[PDB]
């Protein structure tokens, strides 16, 4: 839904083709009829709002952590991580733990708002399995 905005129609088709297929737990599935409409539009709006608020709230310490870490650490996780970022001694310009606490407190609420739109409510929690995978015993919730 987000990618469909302002992208060319043919590359939108290509992206939908590559995204619709999923490999999970050694099996392949494909989403039927991935139509873009009002129902996905409202979720896109809420996602955009939450991302705007997250970008606004985040402190300089949070933003600079990744950049500072790369100066002295080195790992596959980090190098694969920093490939996604735009390419650009010192002391922290401003230290204030109370402001940091309040800012993180609000940022958690915004992250929950962003998380909720992909989260699905848990209906069952399983602790047993038939060794043929046909049945299981679960606790119901919700």
């Amino acid at each position: 839904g987000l990618f469909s905005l302002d992208r060319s129609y043919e590359e939108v088709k290509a992206a939908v083709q590559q995204l619709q297929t999923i490999t999970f737990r050694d099996a392949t599935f494909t989403i039927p009829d991935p139509v873009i409409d009002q129902h996905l539009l409202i979720d896109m709006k809420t996602a955009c709002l939450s991302m705007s608020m997250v970008a606004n709230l985040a402190s300089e310490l949070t933003m600079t952590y990744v950049r500072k870490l790369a100066l002295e650490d080195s790992s596959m996780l980090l190098v694969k991580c920093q490939e996604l970022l735009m390419r650009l001694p010192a002391r922290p310009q401003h230290v204030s733990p109370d402001d940091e606490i309040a800012r993180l407190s609000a940022l958690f609420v915004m992250l929950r708002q962003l998380d909720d739109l992909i989260r699905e409510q848990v209906v069952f929690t399983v602790c047993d399995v038939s060794p043929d995978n046909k049945s299981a015993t679960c606790i119901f919730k919700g």
Partner: protein, 87 residues
């Protein structure tokens, strides 16, 4: 304003010195300036010393001397020369 946000280990005496700092103002009596300045300066130096957590005087009947904190020596002597020129 900057001293409010510093993570002092003991907020009480820090808040006292913040209060005496923020209360300061001049009453336009030309003779009263020096003592107001001295009060503000001793409180500020106390706060700076606590921030760097260097030791500070505690003997009764005695007060912290006014001096620059961790300032570069050459700049200190230049400032002294400027103050002598003013004198």
């Amino acid at each position: 304003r900057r001293g409010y946000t510093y993570p002092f280990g003991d907020r009480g005496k820090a808040r006292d010195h913040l209060a005496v700092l923020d209360r300061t103002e001049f009453d336009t009596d030309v003779r009263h300036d020096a003592e107001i300045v001295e009060r503000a300066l001793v409180s500020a130096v106390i706060l700076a010393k606590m921030s760097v957590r260097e030791t500070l005087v505690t003997a009764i009947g005695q007060t912290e001397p006014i001096a620059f904190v961790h300032l570069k020596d050459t700049e200190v002597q230049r400032i002294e020369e400027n103050l002598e020129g003013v004198r």
